Enzyme design. Structure first.
Site, mmCIF file in Angstrom:
data_model
loop_
_atom_site.group_PDB
_atom_site.id
_atom_site.type_symbol
_atom_site.label_atom_id
_atom_site.label_comp_id
_atom_site.label_asym_id
_atom_site.label_seq_id
_atom_site.Cartn_x
_atom_site.Cartn_y
_atom_site.Cartn_z
ATOM 1 N N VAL A 102 0.882 -1.185 0.000
ATOM 2 C CA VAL A 102 0.000 0.000 0.000
ATOM 3 C C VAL A 102 0.912 1.226 0.000
ATOM 4 O O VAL A 102 1.964 1.215 0.665
ATOM 5 C CB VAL A 102 -0.957 -0.010 1.206
ATOM 6 C CG1 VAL A 102 -1.809 1.247 1.202
ATOM 7 C CG2 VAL A 102 -1.811 -1.264 1.249
ATOM 8 N N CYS A 103 0.517 2.246 -0.750
ATOM 9 C CA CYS A 103 1.170 3.554 -0.729
ATOM 10 C C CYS A 103 2.646 3.368 -1.085
ATOM 11 O O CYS A 103 2.951 2.580 -2.003
ATOM 12 C CB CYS A 103 0.914 4.186 0.633
ATOM 13 S SG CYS A 103 1.215 5.966 0.631
ATOM 14 N N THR A 104 3.551 4.032 -0.377
ATOM 15 C CA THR A 104 4.998 3.972 -0.690
ATOM 16 C C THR A 104 5.622 2.638 -0.272
ATOM 17 O O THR A 104 6.811 2.433 -0.534
ATOM 18 C CB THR A 104 5.709 5.186 -0.115
ATOM 19 O OG1 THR A 104 5.359 5.299 1.271
ATOM 20 C CG2 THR A 104 5.351 6.425 -0.898
#
Lengths: 229, 227
Positions: A102-104
């Site tokens: 998820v995300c970075t």
């Protein structure tokens, strides 16, 4: 039970906690799942907001995982150059049913060599850093490429986790969890994307990220060089 | 001068009711967020996730915002005189008295929904009227300084609504963009209105034992407010 689906989240200092806790509450709603929070040793880990979470297992003691999930946050820059964390991720990804972020968190998968020639997404502000890690950058909120699933920025973890729930079980099970979560979002503003937010808000967002982006670009090209050697 | 925001952290909380709003509101300038229980230390959520209370009731500073999350653990809180007294104490001066999901049933047991528009989780909405609320089928409901959110994930919509009230629209929009909160759910089953009939049947079947036990707790809590 002893036959439970084994789901592991990497829990690291300065994690963005919603990247982990959103998916955790979705996936913990599924039948006979065991969820692990993994770090170098069990014990307290402080998220970027100051929320204290608790790692349940070390890298050494973690059982083979069906699903590995890497959240993002301020702490990803350190993880992208942590040989112990990267070795753990590569070991688990060898046999996992799904390899996820998820995300970075997808920049950590990138640093581990797991995005080479693969479709991936990440947080809108850091999307440019995918290509140097060998990814095909996709501007979609949940991206599948074989057994790789990546979510976009922070709250995309909820959409990601319902997508993963349908793959682990079926659409009917994922829909039941969606209904139990009352996940029929009605955001009070339309500023969740750089394409829809007021231009003033995006420019501010871009400027406030500038120093982090320049630092992460240098870490990213150091990590890319290690994959090349 | 810092805005003091307090969440009640209790055993068997539904953690996303707390952690969603927490990450939105902790993103704002000049706030301090507290996780309140009877004593500081570990509090285990319904999923087995371990959270950490930062303050006792006694050490909690006067709050600008109190927020009650929901979860399996609310039934105990609805008949806990210490928790209800603590909530009334903070509600007395708080700028905003708030909840997410079944946290509004705890506000109701404390007497704080009498004559007010409120919502809760769709499966437990019938319990608002016996606690004196005017039940409204909307995802975030404001009545004066009371804001209530609907079921679990409504906490994110609730928290962005609250952020705009504490600060302004531009501040809320900045946080929405940082959180990339442009949802694209993979199914349309988030409401009993839109979910397939088979999915609604199963969700109601799973909730039935919890609803019956909360019907009984609710009517004891209502009888105490009347007497």
């Amino acid at each position: 039970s002893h036959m439970a689906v084994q789901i592991g989240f990497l829990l690291f200092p300065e994690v963005q906690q919603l990247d982990l806790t959103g998916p955790h509450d979705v996936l913990a709603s599924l039948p006979d799942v065991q969820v692990h929070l993994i770090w170098k040793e069990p014990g307290p880990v402080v998220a970027s907001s100051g929320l204290v979470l608790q790692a349940t297992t070390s890298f050494a003691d973690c059982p083979p995982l069906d699903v590995i999930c890497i959240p993002g946050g301020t702490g990803v820059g350190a993880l992208m150059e942590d040989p112990q964390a990267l070795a753990f991720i590569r070991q688990q990804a060898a046999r996992a049913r799904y390899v996820t972020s998820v995300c970075t968190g997808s920049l950590v998968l990138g640093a581990a060599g797991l995005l080479q020639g693969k479709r991936a997404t990440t947080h809108w502000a850091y999307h440019e850093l995918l290509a140097p890690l060998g990814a095909i950058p996709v501007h979609e909120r949940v991206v599948r490429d074989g057994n790789l699933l990546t979510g976009a920025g922070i709250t995309a973890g909820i959409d990601f986790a319902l997508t993963l729930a349908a793959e682990l079980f079926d659409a009917a099970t994922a829909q039941r969890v969606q209904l139990q979560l009352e996940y029929a979002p009605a955001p009070p503003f339309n500023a969740g994307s750089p394409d829809t937010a007021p231009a003033s808000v995006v420019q501010q967002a871009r400027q406030r990220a500038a120093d982090s982006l320049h630092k992460r670009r240098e870490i990213t090209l150091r990590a890319a060089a290690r994959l090349a050697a």
